[PDB]
């Protein structure tokens, strides 16, 4: 009984680990896209700040 | 493993003058045939396709076993109830079932 229970727990743990890996990959690519958009906005803001500083 | 066997009586002379208490003899023969058939296949095949092969083979083995006794009993049909795993490891099995849903 202990051996079969251990095998079933092994299968369940493998399935959950696969799901967690997929979720982690999706979250990683989402974070990359968020960072890229924020960096683009920050670059535009820096350009505006430089324009204002030169005008002053 | 759980099964139900339904039978009827023909040739009353044989039913009364062949075997002492044919009901108990048929019960023991059914248990022996079911033991013989369940041990042939592996566990997962029993768990998944147990409704047809195991139930079907059991019927053939039961007929073959009770043929020499000549009880006069005709075997109508044997059906399926459950191939549940033992009570001690049920938690492991249903957790493994719910693991796929958790992953999704």
For residues B42 and A41, give the distance between their C-alpha atoms in angstroms, rounded to a whole number: 62
Q: How far is A30 from chain B (nearest CA, A)?
A: 19
The number of folded domains in chain B is 1
The answer as to whether B95 is a domain residue is: no
> Residue B54's domain spans which residues?
1-90
The answer as to whether B102 is a domain residue is: no
The answer as to whether B79 is a domain residue is: yes
* Interface mutation vs chain A, best among B92, B97, B101, most A CBs within 10 Å: B92
Q: How far is B39 from chain A (nearest CA, A)?
A: 17
The answer as to whether B103 is a domain residue is: no
A12 touching B (Cβ < 8 Å): yes
The answer as to whether B38 is a domain residue is: yes
Method: cryo-EM
**Sign of the CA dihedral running A31, A33, A36, A38:** negative
CA dist B74 to A26, B3, B46, B57, Å? 63, 17, 27, 17
Nearest CA in chain A to B87: A1
The answer as to whether B98 is a domain residue is: no
Q: In this structure, what are the phi and psi dihedrals at residue B82, rounded to the nearest 5 degrees? A: -165, 145
Residue B74, classed as helix, strand or coil, is strand
The answer as to whether B104 is a domain residue is: no
Angle at B83 between CA A6 and CA A17, to 5 degrees: 35
């Amino acid at each position: 009984y202990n051996r079969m229970r251990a095998e079933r727990e092994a299968v369940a743990r493998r399935h959950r680990s696969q799901g967690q890996e997929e979720a982690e990959k999706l979250r990683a690519t989402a974070d990359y896209e968020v960072t890229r958009t924020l960096a683009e906005a920050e670059r535009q803001g820096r350009i505006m700040r430089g324009e204002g500083d030169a005008e002053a | 493993v759980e099964m139900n066997v339904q039978y009827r009586v023909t040739n009353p002379e044989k039913y009364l003058y062949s075997v002492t208490s044919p009901d108990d003899s048929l019960r023991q023969a059914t248990d022996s045939a079911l033991r013989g058939v369940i041990g042939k296949y592996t566990m997962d095949r029993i768990l998944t396709e147990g409704r047809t092969v195991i139930r079907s083979d059991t019927q053939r083995e039961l007929e073959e076993t009770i043929r020499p006794y000549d009880m006069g009993i005709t075997l109508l049909d044997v059906n399926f109830q459950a191939a549940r795993p033992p009570e001690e490891v049920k938690a492991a099995f249903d957790d493994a079932i719910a693991a796929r849903e958790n992953e999704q």
